[PDB]
Amino acid sequence: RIERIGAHSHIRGLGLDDALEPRQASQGMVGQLAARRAAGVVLEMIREGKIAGRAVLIAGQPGTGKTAIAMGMAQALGPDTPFTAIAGSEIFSLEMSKTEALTQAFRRSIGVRIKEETEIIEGEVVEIQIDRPAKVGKLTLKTTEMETIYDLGTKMIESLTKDKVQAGDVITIDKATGKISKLGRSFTRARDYDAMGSQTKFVQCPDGELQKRKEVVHTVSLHEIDVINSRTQGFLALFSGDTGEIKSEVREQINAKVAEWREEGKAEIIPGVLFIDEVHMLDIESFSFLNRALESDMAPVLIMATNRGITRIRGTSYQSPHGIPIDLLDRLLIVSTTPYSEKDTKQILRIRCEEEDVEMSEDAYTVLTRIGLETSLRYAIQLITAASLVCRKRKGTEVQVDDIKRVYSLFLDESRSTQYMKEYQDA
């Protein structure tokens, strides 16, 4: 519950209507109807997943809400669909090539819902009488509507001895493997032992004696390749990034078995999204790889964001729009974000204030909207926070003009920093 509000916490989805009509202000967003409708339609395409290898480029001036609309789409997509957010400079690893990192990122945003039929027996253990030779045992499971006694085997008795199960424990035994899983207790333990005090759990299902076809959908991403590349996979799946596995017999074989599962009804493919923020940092080799990697059937939807116009492509000398080669730039379609006006800026500032739980006068809102239209929006939020803190220190109830104007001089913007920078501190 203790998680602080970040720069994109004010947004909590992409405000859209039944007909995908964008709204002025909803779900923490304001203005920018065109790019928001583009986000809505690409999100509909993602949730459809019928087509693979689609790319979208979010372009615009800084502070136009590129990362904002990206996080909004991520939120609107909701759980059950992977959304791999990554920065352009994260692919540069000292233990795995750029192409390998891109393959990892692509396969990481693809999920397979594996269906598994289970048969679990549950109930209340009324009698767990076990005859230890130092071989024979019987279990008396009880439910709210029926009871049954089961003769325990040697291995089952040993498993029960492993996980201590006293009378009155709510357990869920899997008839397939016999794994002992304790859920709780139905009553106290004799009220006499001067220890082991806990709370009592609710009774089990009436038909819990034998659940026939308990369906559990195990969801896992296509990053499962780490499970095969090495005999010990937890080390690679948890921390180790040195996963330069062999592409042959791993990628192709896993894809083939995933197709077999999809055809045989075991699992279903759920393509996610790969959001590369500041994609301009990718080397030209990474762009050349994305050009071809984006053509596979397992290719997720590649959302990208650029904050530049004509700029040199990293790893070469010639320039291209958005710092992306002409090929990949032409392949994808671009979503331009128009700057926000004064009203939109004021509304965004008000939404941020509401998020931060801070209140300020109308004149404060006006002067702060002015300052934000002049300097920037993020700087306006910084001033919101600073003025709220100055007001709290001042013992006031709401932020007045005298606090925003004070923190404006206390904290400087880059435009004024460079102005006072004429002291030639260093070069």
Partner: protein, 416 residues
């Protein structure tokens, strides 16, 4: 259903009996000379006589060189391996670059080997022990096998009532014998008694590539000696040596071949984005193509006359040096006309599952010939979604117009 891809519409070259390139067939359209050259190339591949040859599918962007190579692969068939590669793939941080290209050349080649495996299955009746005289029982009969100690099982593998299946080089405890009536609740699950004979030999025609054997003999993981387990305990790697690469492997493969044990299956290696490879890659490819054991390689370049990477001083056509560019045949693909653009747009819409009206198709073809064909191809799906939202089953001109208004092409974004 299977999700659509970028090149899932191409099914093959779609040539006539004499190789005549039809206007449109097998998903492809246009590029008659290119598709005829590709027919000749697949004939070469099927010949399985020449080795080390290569071809360059150099052409302007959007001509379909990649889709063309994928159609070539489809036409060739799944038997002959077709290894796709990106120029950036060669750049690795654990294996040498030229060695990456070498292992690619190797995996590109296929090999179909035949082997007879003796399998021992049945419920274990006796497990008395170095050599272990195990007893397997099946519906046919019982046999006391004089198995070797190397197969002695470490895990539970109960002495009795355990169903085991062994083959000569690991054992698999299938499941517990069908004693479900002995106990009412037991952790172990049961399977029926195997009906097949204990000792059975089955011939499996397995298809593998030469690089599989290469990397396997490089760092084997079989055997039972402790030194082996300690060697393969952690950090697998690459960079097989040339002496083991050639020599022993080629000799054993030729042995299997001339003895009827295996059958060589030459494949293809599609090195895409060759225009951005370093000069070292080209210098190694010089000798690679000039080898009696190198497979066919299909290159797909997109750049024109540009500076070769790794030198940043000298320029050459197609970003490939002249000495190499001459070693590979050139396939010149031309740009599609607005009519062909509209035709391929309609083909993709049919494959992609989208219904488009005549006016909508015309507007899409116009937007394509104006900005880019692939741009309209990308706009196809958004228009279908807009139609669905608006309740229209088929796309109309207004839908594609609104879509274009929402999404700006690369050219328009650059104009801004």
């Amino acid at each position: 259903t299977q999700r659509i891809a970028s090149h899932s519409h191409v099914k093959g070259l779609g040539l006539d009996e004499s190789g005549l390139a039809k206007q449109a067939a097998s998903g492809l359209v246009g590029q008659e000379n290119a598709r005829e050259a590709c027919g000749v190339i697949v004939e070469l591949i099927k010949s399985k006589k020449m080795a080390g040859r290569a071809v360059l599918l150099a052409g302007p962007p959007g001509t379909g060189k990649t889709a063309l190579a994928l159609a070539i692969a489809q036409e060739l068939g799944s038997k002959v391996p077709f290894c796709p590669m990106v120029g950036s793939e060669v750049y690795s941080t654990e294996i040498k670059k030229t060695e990456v290209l070498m292992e690619n050349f190797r995996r590109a080649i296929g090999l179909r080997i035949k082997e007879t495996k003796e399998v021992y299955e049945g419920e274990v009746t006796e497990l008395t022990p170095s050599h272990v005289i195990i007893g397997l029982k099946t519906a046919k009969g019982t046999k006391q096998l004089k198995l070797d100690p190397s197969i002695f099982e470490s895990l539970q593998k109960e002495r009795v009532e355990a169903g085991d299946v062994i083959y000569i080089a690991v054992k698999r405890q299938g499941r517990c014998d069908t004693y479900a009536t002995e106990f009412d609740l037991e952790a172990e699950e049961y399977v029926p008694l195997p009906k097949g004979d204990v000792h059975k030999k089955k011939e499996i025609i397995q298809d593998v590539t030469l690089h599989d054997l290469d990397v396997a003999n490089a760092r084997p993981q079989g055997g039972q000696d402790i030194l082996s387990m300690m060697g393969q305990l952690m950090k697998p790697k690459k960079t097989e040596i040339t002496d083991k690469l050639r020599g022993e492997i080629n000799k054993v493969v030729n042995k299997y071949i001339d003895q009827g044990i295996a059958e060589l299956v030459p494949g293809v290696l599609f090195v895409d984005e060759v225009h951005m490879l370093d000069i070292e890659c080209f210098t190694y490819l010089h000798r690679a193509l000039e080898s009696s054991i190198a497979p066919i390689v299909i290159f797909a370049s997109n750049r024109g006359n540009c500076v070769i990477r790794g030198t940043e001083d000298i320029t050459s056509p197609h970003g490939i040096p002249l000495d190499l560019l001459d070693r590979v045949m050139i396939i010149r693909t031309m740009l599609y006309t607005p009519q062909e653009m509209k035709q391929i747009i309609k083909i993709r819409a049919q494959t992609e599952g989208i219904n488009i009206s005549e006016e909508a198709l015309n507007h899409l073809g116009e937007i394509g010939t104006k900005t880019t064909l692939r741009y309209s191809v990308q706009l196809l799906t958004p228009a279908n979604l807009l139609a669905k939202i608006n309740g229209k089953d088929s796309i109309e001109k207004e839908h594609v117009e609104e879509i274009s208004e929402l999404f700006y092409d690369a050219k328009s974004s650059a104009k801004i």
